[PDB]
């Protein structure tokens, strides 16, 4: 079923984006005075922070490219999670039809 493949595909893709985002953030932030997003372990925690849109404020980019990377993370995360919500709807809508005969 498409909605399930998509969900899954969306999860593997998000994990890729997170990892690539941790890498790209450090590359972008290092070199900028006062920057804090400069070691991979925390950067990875930051990407998870961003994609889930929780945004604590303990870490965030300050360079143009860092922020640009941050926007791809947010958007991939929002889109990905929004797709799970959508696939859960197709499951419910499908099951609610069965329960009515159709």
């Amino acid at each position: 079923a498409l909605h399930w493949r998509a969900a899954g595909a969306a999860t593997v893709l998000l994990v890729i984006v997170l990892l690539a985002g941790s890498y790209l953030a450090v590359l972008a932030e290092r070199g900028a005075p006062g920057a804090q997003l400069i070691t991979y372990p925390r950067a990875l925690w930051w990407s998870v922070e961003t994609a889930t849109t929780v945004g604590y404020g303990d870490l965030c980019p300050v360079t143009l490219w860092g922020r640009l990377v941050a926007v791809v993370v947010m958007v991939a995360g929002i889109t990905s999670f929004g797709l799970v919500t959508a696939a859960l709807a197709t499951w419910f809508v499908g099951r609610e039809q069965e329960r009515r005969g159709h």
Epitope: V26, L27, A35, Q36, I38, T39, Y40
Partner: antibody, heavy 118, light 106 residues
Framework: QVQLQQPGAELVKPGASVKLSCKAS????????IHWVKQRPGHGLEWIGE????????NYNEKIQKKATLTADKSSSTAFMQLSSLTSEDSAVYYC???????????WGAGTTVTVSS | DILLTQSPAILSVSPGERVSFSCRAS??????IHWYQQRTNGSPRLLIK???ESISGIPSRFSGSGSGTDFTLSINSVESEDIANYYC?????????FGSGTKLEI
């Protein structure tokens, strides 16, 4: 085994330029950064800059005059520091170190003693 | 850019005694401080990372503690092999910076 190998010494004439090397062995990750640290006799450690080999980007210390230019050779696992127009101020021991992107210098090289004399 | 203050610059202690090295940051940096040892003629060698984490191949004698702006490197029961220069290094904010150093003396 010796993770970072550096030449023992380099002699340079005021104004001339030298190119120091740092050969790495052992585990190498795409998340590695090579650092260069300058130490004058009797004094402390001074960070010069860093290079991310797997990508090739370099950042430098903004407070001190920029006399360095970092490059790296992915194939031979060698990091290079290009010092130009050296003066007596630039004579010192230059160490290279490897950081795994977690902020601390895991291993340092024996360091190359540079001397700027005529 | 973060300034790491190391004072006193020299520390005199007697054999077997406990010694403590101080390192203060000009702003809060969590536990992003690392300690290096450097003997006469040798290159620096990581002693403690992240203010208090052990490194393999280093006498259980060495420990560290602190968080925020005040950090300590302690040697329980000093001994001649420990005579050297000690530096702290921070990785909280770019660029990484080093302390001016503290010389140990028996």
């Amino acid at each position: 085994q010796v993770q970072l190998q550096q030449p023992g010494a380099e002699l340079v004439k005021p104004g001339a330029s030298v190119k120091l090397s740092c050969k790495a062995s052992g585990y190498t990750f795409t998340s590695d950064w090579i650092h260069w640290v300058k130490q004058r006799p009797g004094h402390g450690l001074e960070w010069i800059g860093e290079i991310i080999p797997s990508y090739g980007r370099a950042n430098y210390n903004e407070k001190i005059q920029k006399k360095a230019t970092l490059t790296a050779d992915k194939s031979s696992s060698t990091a290079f520091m290009q010092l130009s127009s050296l003066t007596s101020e630039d004579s010192a021991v230059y160490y290279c170190a490897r950081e795994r992107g977690d902020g601390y210098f895991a291993v340092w090289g024996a360091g190359t003693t540079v001397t700027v004399s005529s | 850019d973060i300034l790491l203050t190391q004072s006193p610059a020299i520390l005199s202690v007697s054999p077997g005694e406990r010694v403590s090295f101080s390192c203060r940051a000009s702003q809060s940096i969590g536990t992003d401080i690392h300690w290096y040892q450097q003997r006469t003629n040798g290159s620096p060698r990581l002693l403690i990372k992240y203010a208090s984490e052990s490194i393999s191949g280093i006498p259980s004698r060495f420990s560290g503690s602190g968080s925020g702006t005040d950090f300590t490197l302690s040697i329980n029961s000093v001994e001649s092999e420990d005579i050297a220069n000690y530096y702290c290094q921070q990785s909280n904010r770019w660029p990484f910076t080093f302390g001016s150093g503290t010389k140990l003396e028996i």
